[PDB]
């Protein structure tokens, strides 16, 4: 299977699914490197972020666990189609790139924080990550190119 995938078993349904330990994505279907990729992201900061502040809040006080719960809720609505990634990023991302619907532009290896970079380059074009942890906080990453 493609870089970083493994089989797993649903605890609730017993049905097999697939999980990527680089991007933290999970899916039911069996899944099937460039100089640069283009990604958007939605960042949720927490009280141990490297800079716990953003355009949304002068003092970000939420815990890491609380930030993960927010991230998980956003992923759920994106995957159900109730909301779009671009819409949630514009409204709730703690990165100034919120004003660009989360778009970071194109980048090479070496420029971003390593867990972010590895998830970005392991996604297929159009793919979304699960929660990705860095010193900035927790991200949802969408590879657009
Ligand atoms: O934080 C890096 C970054 C990248 C892209 C951006 N685009 C628009 C506004 C702010 C932006 C910030």
């Amino acid at each position: 299977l493609p870089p970083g995938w493994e089989k797993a078993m649903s605890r609730s349904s017993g049905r097999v699914y697939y999980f990527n330990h680089i991007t933290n994505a999970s899916q039911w279907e069996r899944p099937s490197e460039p100089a640069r990729v283009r990604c958007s992201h939605l960042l949720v900061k927490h009280s141990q972020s490297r800079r716990p502040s953003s355009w949304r809040q002068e003092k970000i006080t939420r815990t890491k666990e609380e930030a993960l719960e927010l991230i998980n809720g956003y992923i759920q609505k994106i995957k159900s189609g109730e909301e779009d990634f671009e819409s949630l990023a514009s409204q709730f991302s703690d990165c100034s790139s919120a004003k660009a619907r989360g778009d970071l532009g194109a980048f090479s290896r070496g420029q971003m924080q390593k867990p972010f970079e590895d998830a970005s380059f392991a996604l297929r074009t159009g793919e979304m990550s699960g929660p990705v942890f860095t010193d900035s906080g927790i991200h949802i990453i969408l590879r657009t190119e």
Side-chain angles (χ1 to χ4, degrees), residues 76-140:
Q76 293 186 306
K77 316 158 100 53
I78 297 165
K79 286 199 161 183
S80 65
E82 313 161 61
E83 313 260 8
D84 298 325
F85 173 90
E86 295 93 340
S87 176
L88 296 183
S90 300
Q91 299 171 256
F92 305 121
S93 180
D94 282 310
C95 188
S96 54
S97 60
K99 318 325 208 174
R101 326 161 92 220
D103 176 48
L104 297 174
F107 59 86
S108 154
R109 281 212 185 256
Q111 301 163 224
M112 317 292 287
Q113 303 185 75
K114 190 63 172 143
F116 190 100
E117 166 187 311
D118 285 346
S120 297
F121 278 87
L123 289 167
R124 305 305 65 200
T125 292
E127 270 211 84
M128 207 174 60
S129 76
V132 173
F133 297 80
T134 70
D135 297 303
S136 318
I138 316 175
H139 317 243
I140 306 162

Side-chain angles (χ1 to χ4, degrees), residues 20-31 33-145:
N20 187 301
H21 68 262
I22 309 174
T23 67
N24 284 327
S26 46
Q27 53 183 39
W28 292 118
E29 258 212 74
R30 186 121 155 151
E33 99 169 358
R36 270 161 91 90
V37 296
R38 184 191 187 166
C39 295
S40 300
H41 80 138
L42 190 165
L43 170 66
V44 180
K45 283 188 167 180
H46 50 71
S47 66
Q48 306 174 72
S49 296
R50 166 209 281 131
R51 284 73 182 91
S53 72
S54 80
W55 68 268
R56 321 197 48 226
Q57 267 187 310
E58 185 160 23
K59 186 184 217 216
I60 303 207
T61 54
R62 68 170 72 90
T63 78
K64 218 158 109 163
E65 191 180 279
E66 284 171 333
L68 181 55
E69 203 29 82
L70 289 160
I71 290 272
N72 285 338
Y74 298 147
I75 293 176
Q76 293 186 306
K77 316 158 100 53
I78 297 165
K79 286 199 161 183
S80 65
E82 313 161 61
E83 313 260 8
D84 298 325
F85 173 90
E86 295 93 340
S87 176
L88 296 183
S90 300
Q91 299 171 256
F92 305 121
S93 180
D94 282 310
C95 188
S96 54
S97 60
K99 318 325 208 174
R101 326 161 92 220
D103 176 48
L104 297 174
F107 59 86
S108 154
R109 281 212 185 256
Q111 301 163 224
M112 317 292 287
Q113 303 185 75
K114 190 63 172 143
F116 190 100
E117 166 187 311
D118 285 346
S120 297
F121 278 87
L123 289 167
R124 305 305 65 200
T125 292
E127 270 211 84
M128 207 174 60
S129 76
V132 173
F133 297 80
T134 70
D135 297 303
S136 318
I138 316 175
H139 317 243
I140 306 162
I141 310 169
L142 177 66
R143 178 174 173 203
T144 55
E145 289 170 16

